[PDB]
Amino acid sequence: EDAGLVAEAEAVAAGWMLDFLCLSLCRAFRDGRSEDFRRTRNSAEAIIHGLSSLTACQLRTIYICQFLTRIAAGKTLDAQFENDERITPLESALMIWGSIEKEHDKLHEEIQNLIKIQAIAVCMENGNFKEAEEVFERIFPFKSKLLMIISQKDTFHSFFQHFSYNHMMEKIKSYVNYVLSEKSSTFLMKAAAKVVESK
Amino acid sequence: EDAGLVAEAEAVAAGWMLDFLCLSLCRAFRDGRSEDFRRTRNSAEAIIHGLSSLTACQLRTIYICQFLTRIAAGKTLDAQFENDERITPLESALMIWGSIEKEHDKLHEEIQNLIKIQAIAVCMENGNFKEAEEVFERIFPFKSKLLMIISQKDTFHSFFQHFSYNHMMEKIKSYVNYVLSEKSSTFLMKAAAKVVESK
Ligand SMILES: O=S1(=O)CCCN1Cc1cccc(F)c1
Ligand SMILES: O=S1(=O)CCCN1Cc1cccc(F)c1
């Protein structure tokens, strides 16, 4: 048995599992299946540990997984993340979004700006207004207006209703649909669908 | 898009990933690649969470993974396991070994008896003789002899040298070779090897 060739076959299969789990993560995020998203996320994270060298395409795939993971935890309150990252899940999603090797088109700016406002608004929704001000300081006349809204706990201001959570999710979901179409034809899902269609 | 058929394709692919990760877990255990075993174990555990209904063959596969996992942690000292299971990894491997749907042949008895003695000997090797006596009580003139050996801290007694750790590992490795031959032809590894052979 050639250990080198076995390790190569295992790397090929890890690459296939990564695409399959990204495809599944995208669908669960689109569908709102939280528990399924959490399980697929755990599987993708474990499979990714089995890879030590990634191609440009594989790096793009893992960063999309990390990005959707932070967006899904935007409203969740976990100190462990605040202990290590020292920022909020949505601020962490913003850092990933701005460094993915992808086109900075109109949809990229829309998603970026919605995450920027929602990183502040989710803290206000949770009643943590000191945190909302800290998030504002780390990200940013516009600044004066936005700071007055936070100071006045004006959570339901028309600005927040235009730059809403639902609007952020809809725009991110539209981007996820493009990822889903690109990967819908990857090896593992395509072979899995052919078995189900044969039955 | 039919959600039911997509979920079925995902179940088919989870089944393939399970066989692939079992195959990889078996090879890492056989080869002594500890870090690779730990990563494959984490991947198999995550993939298994994505399955809610398992066939008789799939249950056999997950129990082989659990069995090898306990054997690998036989000498490791972790209270969390002792907190939940309240037993030692090797006693836990013994419970799994005796309930896998498999033939109770000569090799099954050999492995069982080697695990039984090694669950005691690994505690003596770690200097925990009170624990070795507690393990002995939970598992078991033979008992009087074995208890005298533990009481006298006679770790290197000829009985322990015949029922050694190395002998336990060699017998378990021979069983793992049979598992490896049965699964060496599963879909994911077979398709992965064909890609590497083509290059
Ligand atoms: O980025 S992380 O903080 C590293 C620990 C898991 N986090 C999210 C994640 C989800 C899915 C795949 C992945 F590589 C990473
Ligand atoms: O049996 S456990 O205590 C459940 C938590 C993980 N443990 C070992 C394991 C390894 C690999 C696959 C599996 F299903 C289980």
All structural domains of chain B = 56-198 (1.25.40.210)
- A131 contacts A123 by C-beta, under 8 angstroms: yes
Q: What separation in Å is there between the alpha carbon of A48 and the centre of ligand 1?
A: 9
How far does residue B164's CA lie from ligand 2's centre (Å)? 25
Nearest CA residue ID for atom 12, ligand 2: B45
CA–CA distance from B181 to each of A42, B96, B177, B184, B187 (Å)? 29, 21, 6, 5, 14
Does B192 sit within 8 Å of A16, measured CB to CB? yes
**Environment class of residue B103 by beta-carbon count within 10 Å: exposed (0-12), middle (13-18) or buried (19+)?**
exposed
The per-residue DSSP string of A122-146 comes to HHHHTT-HHHHHHHHHHH--HHHHH
| Distances from the Cα of A187 to the Cα of A21, A169, A174, A197, angstroms | 12, 29, 24, 15
Nearest to B116 by CA among B144, B151, B88, B85: B88
Asked if A5 lies within 8 A of B196 by C-beta distance, the reply is: yes
Count of C-beta atoms within a 10 Å radius of residue B60: 17
A16 contacts A186 by C-beta, under 8 angstroms: yes
B95 touches chain A (CB under 8 A): no
Instruction: Give the residue on A whose Cα is nearest the Cα of B36.
Output: A50
| B5 in contact with A, Cβ within 8 Å | yes
Opening angle at CA A126, ends A123 and A132, nearest 5: 20
Chain B stretch 16-75, residues whose beta carbon is closer than 8 A to a beta carbon of chain A? 16-17, 20, 24, 27, 31, 39-40, 42-43, 45-47, 49-50
**Nearest residue of A to residue B46 by CA position?**
A43
C-alpha–C-alpha distance, residues A14 and B23, integer Å: 13
Read off the DSSP letter of residue B102.
S
Cβ-defined contact of A27 to B6 (cutoff 8 Å): yes
Ligand closest to Cα of B42 equals: 2
What is the C-alpha separation between B14 and B37, in angstroms, rounded? 19
> Hey, whose CA ends up nearest to atom 15 of ligand 2?
B66
Angstrom resolution of this structure:
2.2
Tokens representing B145 are 């002899």
Length of chain A: 199
> Separation of B116 CA from ligand 1 center, angstroms?
40
* Long-range pairs for B180-186: beta carbons < 8 A, 24 or more residues apart: B180/B23, B180/B26, B180/B27, B180/B30, B183/B19, B183/B22, B183/B23, B183/B26, B184/B23, B186/B16, B186/B19, B186/B20, B186/B23
| Nearest CB to B9 within list A9, A50, A196 | A196
Give the distance from residue A90's alpha carbon to the nearest chain B alpha carbon, in angstroms: 25
User: Any idea which residue has 């064909």 for tokens?
Assistant: B194
CB atoms inside a 10 Å sphere around CB B133? 16
C-alpha dihedral (B60, B64, B70, B71), degrees to nearest 10: 140
Among B23, B2, B1, B12, smallest CA distance to B190 is for B23
Q: Hey, whose CA ends up nearest to atom 7 of ligand 1?
A: A66
**A118-154 CB burial, b ≥16 within 10 A, e <16:** bbbbbbbeeeebebbbbbbeebeeeeeebbebbeeee
Contact B188, B20 (CB under 8 A): yes
Minimum Cα–Cα distance from A1: chain B residue: B27
| DSSP code per residue over chain A | --HHHHHHHHHHHHHHHHHHHHHHHHHHHHHT-HHHHHHHHHHHHHHHHT-SS--HHHHHHHHHHHHHHHHHTSS---HHHHHHT-S-HHHHHHHHHTTSSS---HHHHHHHHHHHHHHHHHHHHTT-HHHHHHHHHHH--HHHHHHHHHHTT-TT-HHHHHT-HHHHHHHHHHHHHHHHHHHTT-HHHHHHHHHHHH-
Alpha helices in chain B (DSSP H): 3-31, 34-49, 56-72, 79-84, 89-97, 106-125, 129-139, 142-151, 158-162, 165-183, 187-198
Nearest to A147 by CA among A163, A129, A165, A162: A129
Q: How far is CA B176 from the centre of its chain?
A: 9
Pairwise CA distance, residues B12 & A196, whole Å:
8
**How close is the Cα of A64 to the center of ligand 1, in Å?**
10
Closest residue by Cα to residue B52 from A16, A36, A133, A164: A36
Q: At what angle do helices B129-139 and B89-97 cross, to 10 degrees?
A: 20
Return the DSSP state at B141: -
Angle at B111 between CA B106 and CA B115, to 5 degrees: 150
**Structural contact between residues A9 and B193, judged by C-beta atoms closer than 8 angstroms:** yes
> 3-class SS at B98?
coil
Count other C-beta atoms under 10 Å from residue B77's C-beta: 14
Sign of CA dihedral B45, A53, A172, A26: negative
Find chain B residues with C-beta within 8 A of A187's C-beta: 191
Q: How far is the CA of B22 from the centre of ligand 2 (A)?
A: 12
CB nearest to A9's CB, from B9, B31, B192:
B192
Token pair 């942690």: residue? B73
Burial of A25 (0-12, 13-18, 19+ CB in 10 A): buried
Cβ of residue B44 lying under 6 Å from some atom of ligand 2 = yes
DSSP track, B149-172: HHHTT-TT-HHHHHT-HHHHHHHH
Report which of B40, B44, B71 is spatially closest to residue B176, judged by C-alpha positions.
B71
Q: What does the alpha-carbon distance between residue B13 and residue B188 come to, in Å, rounded to a whole number? A: 9
- Are B40 and A49 inside 8 Å of each other by CB? no
The rounded distance, in Å, linking the Cα atoms of A70 and B141 is 62
